[PDB]
Amino acid sequence: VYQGETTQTLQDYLMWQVELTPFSDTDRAIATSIVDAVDETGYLTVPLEDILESIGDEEIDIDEVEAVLKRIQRFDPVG
Amino acid sequence: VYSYTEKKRIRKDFGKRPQVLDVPYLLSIQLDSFQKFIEQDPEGQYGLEAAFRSVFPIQSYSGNSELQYVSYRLGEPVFDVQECQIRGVTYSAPLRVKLRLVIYEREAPEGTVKDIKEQEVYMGEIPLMTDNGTFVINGTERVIVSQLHRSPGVFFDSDKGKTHSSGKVLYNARIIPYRGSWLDFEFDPKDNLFVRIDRRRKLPATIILRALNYTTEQILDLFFEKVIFEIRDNKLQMELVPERLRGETASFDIEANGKVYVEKGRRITARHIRQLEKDDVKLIEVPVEYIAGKVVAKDYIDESTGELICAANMELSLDLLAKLSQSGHKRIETLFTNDLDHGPYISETLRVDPTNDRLSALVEIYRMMRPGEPPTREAAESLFENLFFSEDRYDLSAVGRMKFNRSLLREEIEGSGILSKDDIIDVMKKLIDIRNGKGEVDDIDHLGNRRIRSVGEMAENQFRVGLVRVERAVKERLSLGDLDTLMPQDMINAKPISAAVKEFFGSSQLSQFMDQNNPLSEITHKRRISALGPGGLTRERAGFEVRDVHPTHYGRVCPIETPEGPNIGLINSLSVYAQTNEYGFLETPYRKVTDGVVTDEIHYLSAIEEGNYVIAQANSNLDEEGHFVEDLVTCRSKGESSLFSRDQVDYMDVSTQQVVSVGASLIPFLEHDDANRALMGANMQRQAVPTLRADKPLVGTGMERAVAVDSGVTAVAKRGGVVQYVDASRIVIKVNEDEMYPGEAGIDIYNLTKYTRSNQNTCINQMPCVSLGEPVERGDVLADGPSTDLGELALGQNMRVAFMPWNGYNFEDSILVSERVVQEDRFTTIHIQELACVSRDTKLGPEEITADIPNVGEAALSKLDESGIVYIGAEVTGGDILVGKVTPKGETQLTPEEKLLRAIFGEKASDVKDSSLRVPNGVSGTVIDVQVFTRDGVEKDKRALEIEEMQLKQAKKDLSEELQILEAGLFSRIRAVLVAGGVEAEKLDKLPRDRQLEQLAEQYDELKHEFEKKLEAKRRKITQGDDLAPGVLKIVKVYLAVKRRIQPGDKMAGRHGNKGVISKINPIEDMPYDENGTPVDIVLNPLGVPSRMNIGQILETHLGMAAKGIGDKINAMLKQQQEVAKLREFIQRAYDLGADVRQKVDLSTFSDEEVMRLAENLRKGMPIATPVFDGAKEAEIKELLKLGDLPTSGQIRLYDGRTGEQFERPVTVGYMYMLKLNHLVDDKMHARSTGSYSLVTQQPLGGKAQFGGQRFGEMEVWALEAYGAAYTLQEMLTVKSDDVNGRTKMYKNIVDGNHQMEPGMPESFNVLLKEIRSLGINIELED
Amino acid sequence: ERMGHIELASPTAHIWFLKSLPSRIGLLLDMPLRDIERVLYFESYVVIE
Amino acid sequence: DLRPLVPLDGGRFATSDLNDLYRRVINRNNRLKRLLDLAAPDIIVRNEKRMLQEAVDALLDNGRRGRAITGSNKRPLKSLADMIKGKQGRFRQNLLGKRVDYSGRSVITVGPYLRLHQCGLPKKMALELFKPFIYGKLELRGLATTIKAAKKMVEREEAVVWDILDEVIREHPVLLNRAPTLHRLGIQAFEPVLIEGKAIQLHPLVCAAYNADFDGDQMAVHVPLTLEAQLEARALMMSTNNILSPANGEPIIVPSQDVVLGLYYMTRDCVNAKGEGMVLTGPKEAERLYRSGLASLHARVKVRITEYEKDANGELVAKTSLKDTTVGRAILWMIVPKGLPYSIVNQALGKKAISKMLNTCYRILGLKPTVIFADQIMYTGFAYAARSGASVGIDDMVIPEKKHEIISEAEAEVAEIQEQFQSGLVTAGERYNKVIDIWAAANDRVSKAMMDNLQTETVINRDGQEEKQVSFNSIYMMADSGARGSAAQIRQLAGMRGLMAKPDGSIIETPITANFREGLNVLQYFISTHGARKGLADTALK
DNA sequence: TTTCGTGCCAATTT
DNA sequence: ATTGGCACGAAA
Ligand SMILES: [Mg+2]
């Protein structure tokens, strides 16, 4: 019988790097939201306001999302 | 008299028994079988003719038209074997069959010939066998293995009381046709005969008899002897035959002529029978009680009433006797059914049988064959006729008919292919006779009951299988009336026949990739006999008896060459001198002994014929005239061996090596080895890998040359001549004028195979072994293939070995190897791997092989040429790009971001992906060959044009050589004609070669035109494109070559079953050394010798030491220049050693140059040949050691390399032949931390090709449970295999230095729950 | 983990409760298995009332 | 997602078996629905219902009823029942056993220098096996600031990652397993030692529990992850914890072969050896004399030996006395712990004697001294077996001089019985039994003569007389010490092979009278193949 | 009308 | 091939 193999995509690599990064719970949720909105070419497809809305918490400013995004942008591949 | 190849290096032979029969061609069983299938036969059997005649003529139901077969022809193959292997196609020939369609008329007697149309049609491609007995299916060589199956005929067997609880034997008989249905007869514990058709529900044995139109009276007459009751007006006076009463007890008063020979209660003895015979006592009075159980034979009806008084086969009673007596009857017929000899089985079977007619039996047969449908008379009759009496559904072949007649003790051998009434009656009679006690059952394992089927017969069967389907299609399509226009070309289609042939030659169980480790592997594979396959046995249902060695295997099947494991006893190997009959039975040759002297005439005897004679053993001493010396010769007579007289001998064996196979005949001192270790050595000898340089065994048996030559790995001169040109890749031989064909330039060109990949990813390379200008003869070796040295098989290396323990580094089969062996590259091997890149056609444009990969850097493209292909000779490793390919991605809408990207970085980077071919991780090597296949109509790149130019150059070179030889001859004739006139002494020399003469000029022009035509044809053949596949544009194949060195973990072995693994590579100064400071190469543990009982290795070591001593003497004499006289005197002394050997080497017929060449070839040791059962004795070995100034015992004193002190005991030091097996640690080591998983089970994959993990099976779980390690088992079960969240959490914790886990739930349990729920069962977890 | 369903046009017997040697349907209805199979595969009729 | 499609080259998606069954069921159901809506004649709807029933039966359990439907190449399709049950089903393939991460395998070699608790692991395997630990350790000490930095450092195989690996594999047991795992001793825990190459080094003393030999065997290695797993490996599955067999209580660390041969060779005496008859101050003086070439290892001397015995309260009390012993026994005495008597080594040490010594050491002193004693015994046995230079030659297989006469007498007796049978005095069975008994007696006589000739030798006395002592024949020493070989195998090597049996079981009357030093003719070799192949087939099939 | 035997089917085989 | 359960047929 055939079952197939699991292939690693760009988002899988990004989430693997996120899980091995010393983030907090809120920072990890923001990182998950950011990695979700990444296309095949590696560009962010949504504005940060949409990510902030998707977080669903009213105690987070745009600055924390900016910091998390800057940390993510230094993953492999760079850029 | 020795040939040129053999005269260079003569191997001393210790054999003493003269040879009377040469070793035959080792690949005859394939070539003859395929020739029988292919060649034209005037008779109607043995090949395609038989298949065509067994189907044609094909006639329709209306009978107004039919197809007639005339003849067939095989066309020339398009490509040669080398071309087929290079391209990757099938080496095959087209089949053209000349069919003929006739048209019959109506309302006329018979069939009026209205019209006849004959046409040649194409029936497909038939694969052809090469000169070496192989088939090229898809650029790869394949071997079809012969099958050992059960012969057709009739066989009588029984169950050894196992079926019944009382231990009663129930005999049975089985009729097996070659094509049809089987027929079984069997008994029961109640002694009733029963019949069985196609292994179905049991039926009474009289059902078939009644279906064959036989009445009860006729059956009783056939199966019983009549006894005549004569009513002589008083008490049924009886005519008595004395022999009828043997072994019986009289139940009445027997008196005759007033004398009571036997009284009441007295049993009849032999003396009483003798007295009755002497007196010829006939008339006997019997009482009415004697007929209380006698059974009447026929039917008797009262003349008055006219009705049936009693039916046939029923016991008479007193009332019935009175009724028949009062009806005016005097003659009665009964059956003799004594309980000792003539057992009454048929009568009881008739009693059990319900049917009493001819139609109800057919109805019951039809009901049993096809249940659940109403019976029909016509359907039952048709089924009964087609079961056994139709030529189109039942066939008893010639071998089957011969076996049937021989089993029935008939005289005629030929006959019909269908059963008859007489055959069934005789089978029943023989079974009844066996039941009575006069007969013997058959042995299924006897080689006279087992038959050999080769490739030709299977190909014929598959061709017939296709042809019957073609005939069915023709019958289906011939019903329509269009006879005025249609042609036979469109009447038939060749697709089914070609499909069947290709399926047989490509996907059959007996069609396998040829084992190509060494020539011995190929020879063994081509001579393999298998009991498995379609129509054979299964390894799970075989049993012990079929796997045993039978006496009839003597001289036909090797008893010490079979795989160990599930296939033991089921895969066999042919013997050296074994052949097959015209019926396919194995036979072996013998010398006939006439008038007490062993003659020279050779008779091939089969298993059946062998048992009737007394055959003397090969190891029997004779005289110069051929007389046995011992008066009690050991001989085999009837499957057992015993002592016989000199005058009772009928035959003798022809050789001492006819009982073993080719592989077992290459083991020196085989008679000193145990059978299990001999089997292990034979199995290991054919998996050795060739090394960089071949090395002859230096201790052999004499069979190396036969194996090397009969295997097609070497280049053999087809005709004699002189070496005109020699090179590392080609040899040109100038043929002698006495072997040249008229009107031909006599030259033979041999293009050598250089560094090609085999089926096992090894290296195939040929090296010349001839010099420029030396003479050659037909059959001489010109080039040596892999594992070949001067035309001799060379599988391993000669190593200096000592038998002693060394600090535990040879503990339990471990091997210690010196560093000098590694430094000299004696066991370094070459391995070649192939990679393929395919460019196809997509919907968004085609994929392109190109050098412009936009995302990668400049350096990564440094080893690619202008066409995007790696250079030849580049050193590559894991991740390097071999072929650059891009896959187009297409979108017709350009977003502003995409427009910005195109503007900044160019449009080429966009709308393109990367799908280049890259070297897999862990793979390295050098690019040695690149091949490009392009579809027809597609433009070729630069690389393909270069390859085509390279291919054209060689053809141009060969044609130019032949053309220039012919031109030289023609210009010589021109000069001979021209100087006959103006005798221009210097004008011709000064003038160029332009120069009856007109006829020669015309011949020159015609020769140039013909050679231009040949060159154009070769260019067209080279330029021809390929038909790859639907949607495939181009294919690029790249070959990488790597060299593997020896290292710890590699498997080494000898020829006596002594295998081991290298444990340490020791520096040179640590190895033991002798008084001269010479270290040993390998140290072997002596403790493995006594328990295994393989003593042949010690004798081989001693003999190799002696040979090396002789070689050292020769080399010492060579280093200091001495005259040829002393060298030849010493060599003559060396060759004359031995106790009455059969080899005579006279160096007086050698020239000085030949003697010097022989000495140069003998300066590294003198090779020695010892047959398997005619080898050298210990005294001869000691004499040879004395000749070399070496100790007789074969043991010297050694010193420790680390301390310099002497070992306390002498150590056996010598030379042994060692092999490197194809079990390399480089292919064994594998490790994994994390990787890919299955999509369904989410568990790690298996294998080394993927980054797979090791399986933790049930037994390991049991072992962990027995320890009590619950946490280890739990982490094995969840966080390591199939807990998706647990794997990530465990990895994160490990990276953070926290060695803790959250177990979770396995995913396979959820998969199981879903699968069970899909069956309509509600299974769930609760609480 | 999401399953679907198919609405059969006519009722169909489950083969596990039919062809297992201790036939649950046959033992429950107290009928031979051959008659049950003949009725199920449209080879014979059976009276309901 | 539990029934995925097959994506292959060329864009072909093909189909699966369950998908095909579902498609057939759906097509039949849709056709039946349409026919029922159209009010078709009953003769067609009955056939459609029957086909739907057959399709559902094939989907649920294909082949149970009627004929199983097949695929493209005439093979039955796999149904849900096939997935559930069988050896290839879920239970036995994915639940009771599975493939795991952090595992490897390779060929095994012998490490003679290893301790009982140590194994030899290639560092190339260890780099892959302990990769997350290496990542964590690299991040811990500031060598790498991100996970990708450590990933690239490990990919490049820098010099510091080897030190990191050596630090992280310091105290971390690994599990070695060899298939088939017949008992719980087939998996054991060892401390790794990083080595060069690609083969795993194994301690010789644990080769008996694994039933492993160094002729191509491969082993698998697993890495425990959590603290509980590591402590279970160290405290339960460690090799030093497994010294008694759970089946019967017998030891499983019995020395064999080279160690036994060396210890037997060193603890033997010769009648007149160099250095015989001198008095030594102790074992150290004996070793000093032996290493200087002044005394023989087998010389009989007197040595001052001090030995300790356990008192009533459990304390050790020493006694010193002069003992008549040999140099080799005194040298070996330096290895025995203090709690054993000197009589345990003052003899010729075979396999049984060494096993008894180890068992006594374990019973009297405990576990750790037993492990140390076993390691020292293995080291000394290997060293002195190498130093002895024991070999094997063709002259070691000594043929008795009276074999020919015995064979001739047996032949004369069987000839006389055959002539008497030709005269008709007895039947066939009695003659057959008499011939068998005669040949058995001849074989027994030949074996006795061979063993009598092989087991003794003649030596010159100190005065110049003759003495008879135990032979130093290499084959006899190997057989007598219990290292390799038994009496029957030596009989086959140097005496007649005896009677052979037909494959059914009946004994052939005429025996093989030739040994293995001599050659067997074609007929005898062919006769022996029946028993050889019968044994091999039984071993393969059981 | 009960009771034991015989033929058939289904399970198993690293 | 071998073993065991189940329906069937012949006999007490
Ligand atoms: Mg092994």
CSV table of C-alpha atoms in Angstrom, one decimal, chain B residues 544 547-550 554 558-560 562 565 568 572 617 619 634 636 641 656 659 670-676 678 803-809 811-814 840 1051 1059-1063 1085-1087 1090-1093 1095 1099 1102 1173 1178 1182 1193 1195 1205 1207-1212 1225-1226 1228-1233 1237 1240-1241 1243-1246 1251 1253-1256 1258-1261 1263-1264 1266-1267 1269-1272 1275-1277 1280-1282 1290-1291 1294-1295 1299 1301 1308-1309 1311-1312 1314-1316 1318-1319, chain D residues 1-2 4 9 60 80 83-84 90-107 109-110 112-113 125 128-129 132-133 135-136 139 175 177 180-185 187 198 204 207 212-216 218 222-230 232 236-237 242 256-258 265 290-291 382-383 385-395 397 472 474 477-478 483-484 489 492-493 497 503 510 516-523 525-526 529-530 532-533 536-538 540-541:
chain,number,residue,atom,x,y,z
B,544,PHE,CA,11.8,-32.3,3.7
B,547,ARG,CA,14.9,-31.0,-0.4
B,548,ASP,CA,17.1,-34.1,0.2
B,549,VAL,CA,19.9,-35.5,-1.9
B,550,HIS,CA,18.8,-38.4,-4.0
B,554,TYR,CA,24.9,-38.7,-8.8
B,558,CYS,CA,25.7,-31.1,-7.5
B,559,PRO,CA,25.0,-32.2,-3.9
B,560,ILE,CA,27.2,-29.5,-2.3
B,562,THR,CA,22.7,-24.9,-2.9
B,565,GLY,CA,17.9,-20.9,4.1
B,568,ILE,CA,17.7,-25.1,0.4
B,572,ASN,CA,20.2,-26.7,-7.7
B,617,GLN,CA,33.8,-45.7,-9.2
B,619,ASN,CA,38.8,-43.7,-8.0
B,634,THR,CA,33.3,-50.6,-5.2
B,636,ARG,CA,26.8,-48.6,-7.4
B,641,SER,CA,27.0,-49.0,-3.2
B,656,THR,CA,36.6,-37.7,-10.7
B,659,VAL,CA,29.9,-35.4,-9.4
B,670,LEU,CA,37.9,-30.3,-1.6
B,671,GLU,CA,38.1,-33.9,-0.4
B,672,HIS,CA,39.6,-32.7,2.9
B,673,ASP,CA,36.7,-30.4,3.7
B,674,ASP,CA,33.4,-31.0,5.5
B,675,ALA,CA,30.3,-30.7,3.3
B,676,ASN,CA,28.8,-27.7,5.1
B,678,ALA,CA,32.3,-26.7,1.2
B,803,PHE,CA,47.8,-19.1,12.0
B,804,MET,CA,48.1,-17.8,15.6
B,805,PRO,CA,46.1,-15.8,18.1
B,806,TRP,CA,47.1,-12.1,18.3
B,807,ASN,CA,45.9,-10.3,21.4
B,808,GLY,CA,42.2,-11.1,20.7
B,809,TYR,CA,42.0,-9.2,17.4
B,811,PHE,CA,38.6,-13.5,18.2
B,812,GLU,CA,35.6,-15.4,16.7
B,813,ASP,CA,36.3,-15.1,13.0
B,814,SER,CA,37.9,-11.7,13.2
B,840,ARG,CA,9.4,16.6,-20.0
B,1051,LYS,CA,34.0,-9.0,4.9
B,1059,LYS,CA,34.8,-16.1,6.2
B,1060,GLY,CA,35.5,-13.2,8.6
B,1061,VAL,CA,35.4,-9.5,9.2
B,1062,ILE,CA,38.5,-7.3,9.3
B,1063,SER,CA,38.9,-6.0,12.9
B,1085,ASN,CA,42.8,-17.7,14.3
B,1086,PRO,CA,43.7,-21.4,14.4
B,1087,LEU,CA,40.8,-22.1,16.8
B,1090,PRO,CA,39.4,-28.0,14.2
B,1091,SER,CA,35.7,-27.5,14.9
B,1092,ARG,CA,34.8,-26.6,11.3
B,1093,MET,CA,36.8,-29.6,10.0
B,1095,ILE,CA,41.4,-29.0,6.6
B,1099,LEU,CA,47.1,-28.0,2.8
B,1102,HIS,CA,51.5,-25.4,2.7
B,1173,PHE,CA,39.5,-35.8,-6.1
B,1178,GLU,CA,51.3,-34.7,1.4
B,1182,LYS,CA,56.9,-32.1,1.2
B,1193,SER,CA,56.5,-29.4,8.4
B,1195,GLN,CA,56.1,-24.2,10.3
B,1205,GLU,CA,61.0,-11.8,21.3
B,1207,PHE,CA,57.1,-17.0,20.0
B,1208,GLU,CA,57.4,-20.1,22.0
B,1209,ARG,CA,56.0,-22.5,19.3
B,1210,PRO,CA,56.4,-22.9,15.6
B,1211,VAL,CA,53.7,-21.2,13.6
B,1212,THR,CA,52.1,-22.4,10.3
B,1225,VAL,CA,30.6,-1.4,5.6
B,1226,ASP,CA,30.3,1.8,3.5
B,1228,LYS,CA,26.0,-0.8,5.9
B,1229,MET,CA,26.5,2.1,8.3
B,1230,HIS,CA,23.4,4.3,8.7
B,1231,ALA,CA,22.2,6.6,11.5
B,1232,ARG,CA,19.3,9.0,12.0
B,1233,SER,CA,18.1,11.6,14.5
B,1237,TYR,CA,7.5,10.4,8.1
B,1240,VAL,CA,-0.9,7.9,7.0
B,1241,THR,CA,0.8,6.4,10.0
B,1243,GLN,CA,5.9,7.0,11.6
B,1244,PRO,CA,9.6,7.1,10.4
B,1245,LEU,CA,10.3,5.5,7.0
B,1246,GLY,CA,12.5,2.4,6.5
B,1251,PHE,CA,16.8,8.8,6.0
B,1253,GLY,CA,14.9,4.6,11.3
B,1254,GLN,CA,15.3,1.2,12.8
B,1255,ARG,CA,12.3,-1.0,13.5
B,1256,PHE,CA,11.5,-1.7,17.2
B,1258,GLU,CA,7.5,-7.1,19.1
B,1259,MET,CA,10.5,-9.1,20.3
B,1260,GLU,CA,12.3,-5.9,21.4
B,1261,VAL,CA,9.1,-4.8,23.2
B,1263,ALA,CA,12.8,-7.8,26.0
B,1264,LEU,CA,12.0,-4.3,27.4
B,1266,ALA,CA,11.2,-8.4,30.8
B,1267,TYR,CA,13.6,-5.8,32.2
B,1269,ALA,CA,11.9,-0.4,31.8
B,1270,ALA,CA,8.5,1.2,31.3
B,1271,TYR,CA,9.8,4.7,30.5
B,1272,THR,CA,12.2,3.5,27.8
B,1275,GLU,CA,9.4,6.9,24.8
B,1276,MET,CA,10.1,4.3,22.1
B,1277,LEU,CA,6.3,4.1,21.5
B,1280,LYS,CA,10.1,8.7,18.9
B,1281,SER,CA,7.7,7.3,16.3
B,1282,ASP,CA,4.2,8.7,15.8
B,1290,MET,CA,10.8,16.5,23.1
B,1291,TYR,CA,13.1,18.1,20.6
B,1294,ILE,CA,16.3,18.5,24.5
B,1295,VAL,CA,17.6,21.6,22.8
B,1299,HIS,CA,15.3,15.8,29.5
B,1301,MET,CA,8.7,14.2,27.8
B,1308,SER,CA,-1.8,4.9,14.5
B,1309,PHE,CA,-4.3,4.2,17.2
B,1311,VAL,CA,-6.1,5.6,12.3
B,1312,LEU,CA,-7.2,2.2,13.7
B,1314,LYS,CA,-11.2,5.5,12.1
B,1315,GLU,CA,-10.7,2.3,10.1
B,1316,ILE,CA,-12.8,0.2,12.5
B,1318,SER,CA,-15.6,2.7,8.7
B,1319,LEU,CA,-16.7,-0.9,9.0
D,1,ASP,CA,-6.0,11.7,4.3
D,2,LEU,CA,-6.0,8.0,5.4
D,4,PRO,CA,-4.3,9.3,-0.3
D,9,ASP,CA,6.0,11.3,-12.5
D,60,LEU,CA,-16.2,-4.3,3.4
D,80,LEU,CA,-10.8,-2.4,5.2
D,83,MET,CA,-6.0,-3.1,6.6
D,84,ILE,CA,-7.3,-4.1,10.0
D,90,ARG,CA,-2.3,-2.1,11.9
D,91,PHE,CA,-1.9,-4.2,15.1
D,92,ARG,CA,1.3,-6.1,14.3
D,93,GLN,CA,2.9,-3.5,12.0
D,94,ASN,CA,2.2,-0.1,13.5
D,95,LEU,CA,1.0,-0.7,17.1
D,96,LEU,CA,2.9,-3.7,18.6
D,97,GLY,CA,6.0,-2.6,16.7
D,98,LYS,CA,7.2,0.5,14.9
D,99,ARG,CA,10.2,2.3,13.5
D,100,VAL,CA,11.8,4.9,15.8
D,101,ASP,CA,14.1,8.0,15.6
D,102,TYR,CA,17.5,8.3,17.2
D,103,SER,CA,18.5,4.9,16.0
D,104,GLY,CA,21.2,3.4,13.7
D,105,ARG,CA,22.8,0.2,12.7
D,106,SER,CA,26.1,-1.1,11.4
D,107,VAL,CA,28.5,-4.1,11.3
D,109,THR,CA,33.9,-5.8,15.2
D,110,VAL,CA,35.7,-7.0,18.3
D,112,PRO,CA,39.7,-6.5,23.0
D,113,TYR,CA,40.7,-3.4,25.0
D,125,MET,CA,27.1,7.8,13.8
D,128,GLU,CA,24.0,12.2,13.8
D,129,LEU,CA,22.5,10.4,16.9
D,132,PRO,CA,19.9,18.0,19.3
D,133,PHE,CA,22.2,17.6,22.3
D,135,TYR,CA,22.8,22.0,19.3
D,136,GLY,CA,21.8,22.6,22.9
D,139,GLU,CA,23.9,27.3,22.2
D,175,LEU,CA,21.2,0.4,23.8
D,177,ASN,CA,20.4,-4.9,20.0
D,180,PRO,CA,16.5,-11.9,16.5
D,181,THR,CA,15.9,-10.9,20.1
D,182,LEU,CA,15.2,-14.3,21.6
D,183,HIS,CA,15.5,-13.2,25.2
D,184,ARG,CA,15.9,-10.0,27.2
D,185,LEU,CA,19.7,-10.3,26.9
D,187,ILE,CA,19.3,-5.7,24.2
D,198,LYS,CA,32.4,2.7,10.5
D,204,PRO,CA,34.1,-10.3,23.6
D,207,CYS,CA,29.2,-12.1,22.6
D,212,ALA,CA,26.9,-13.0,17.8
D,213,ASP,CA,30.1,-13.7,15.9
D,214,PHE,CA,32.3,-11.4,13.8
D,215,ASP,CA,31.7,-12.7,10.3
D,216,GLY,CA,29.1,-10.2,9.0
D,218,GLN,CA,25.1,-6.2,12.3
D,222,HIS,CA,19.3,3.3,20.2
D,223,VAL,CA,19.7,6.5,22.3
D,224,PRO,CA,17.7,7.0,25.5
D,225,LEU,CA,16.3,10.6,25.7
D,226,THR,CA,14.8,11.3,29.2
D,227,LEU,CA,16.3,11.0,32.6
D,228,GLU,CA,14.1,8.0,33.5
D,229,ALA,CA,15.2,6.2,30.3
D,230,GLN,CA,18.9,6.9,31.1
D,232,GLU,CA,16.7,2.6,33.6
D,236,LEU,CA,18.5,-2.3,34.7
D,237,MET,CA,19.8,-2.9,31.2
D,242,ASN,CA,23.4,-9.0,33.7
D,256,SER,CA,35.8,-19.1,25.8
D,257,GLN,CA,38.3,-19.8,23.0
D,258,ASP,CA,41.4,-17.6,23.1
D,265,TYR,CA,48.7,-22.9,28.4
D,290,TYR,CA,59.8,-15.2,33.1
D,291,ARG,CA,60.2,-11.8,31.4
D,382,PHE,CA,44.4,-12.8,25.4
D,383,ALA,CA,48.0,-11.7,26.2
D,385,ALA,CA,47.4,-16.9,24.1
D,386,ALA,CA,49.1,-14.4,21.8
D,387,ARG,CA,52.5,-15.0,23.5
D,388,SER,CA,52.2,-18.8,23.3
D,389,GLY,CA,52.2,-18.8,19.5
D,390,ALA,CA,49.8,-21.8,19.2
D,391,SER,CA,49.2,-22.8,15.6
D,392,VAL,CA,47.8,-25.8,13.6
D,393,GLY,CA,49.6,-28.0,11.1
D,394,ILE,CA,49.0,-31.1,9.0
D,395,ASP,CA,51.4,-33.0,11.3
D,397,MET,CA,46.6,-34.8,13.1
D,472,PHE,CA,51.5,-30.5,24.1
D,474,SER,CA,48.1,-28.1,19.6
D,477,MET,CA,45.5,-28.8,23.8
D,478,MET,CA,42.6,-27.1,22.1
D,483,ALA,CA,38.3,-24.0,23.9
D,484,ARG,CA,37.2,-25.5,20.5
D,489,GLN,CA,35.5,-34.0,15.7
D,492,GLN,CA,36.8,-37.4,12.4
D,493,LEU,CA,40.0,-35.5,11.8
D,497,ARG,CA,34.6,-41.2,10.0
D,503,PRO,CA,18.1,-39.8,4.1
D,510,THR,CA,29.9,-50.0,4.7
D,516,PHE,CA,40.0,-35.7,6.9
D,517,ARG,CA,43.8,-35.6,6.9
D,518,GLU,CA,43.5,-38.3,4.3
D,519,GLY,CA,41.2,-37.7,1.3
D,520,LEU,CA,37.7,-39.0,0.8
D,521,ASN,CA,36.9,-40.6,-2.5
D,522,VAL,CA,33.9,-39.5,-4.6
D,523,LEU,CA,31.5,-42.1,-3.2
D,525,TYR,CA,31.9,-37.6,0.0
D,526,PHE,CA,28.6,-38.1,-1.9
D,529,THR,CA,26.1,-35.1,1.7
D,530,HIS,CA,22.9,-36.8,2.8
D,532,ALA,CA,25.0,-32.7,5.8
D,533,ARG,CA,22.0,-31.5,3.8
D,536,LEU,CA,21.1,-27.9,7.2
D,537,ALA,CA,17.5,-28.3,6.0
D,538,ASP,CA,16.3,-29.0,9.6
D,540,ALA,CA,16.7,-23.8,8.1
D,541,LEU,CA,13.2,-25.0,8.6
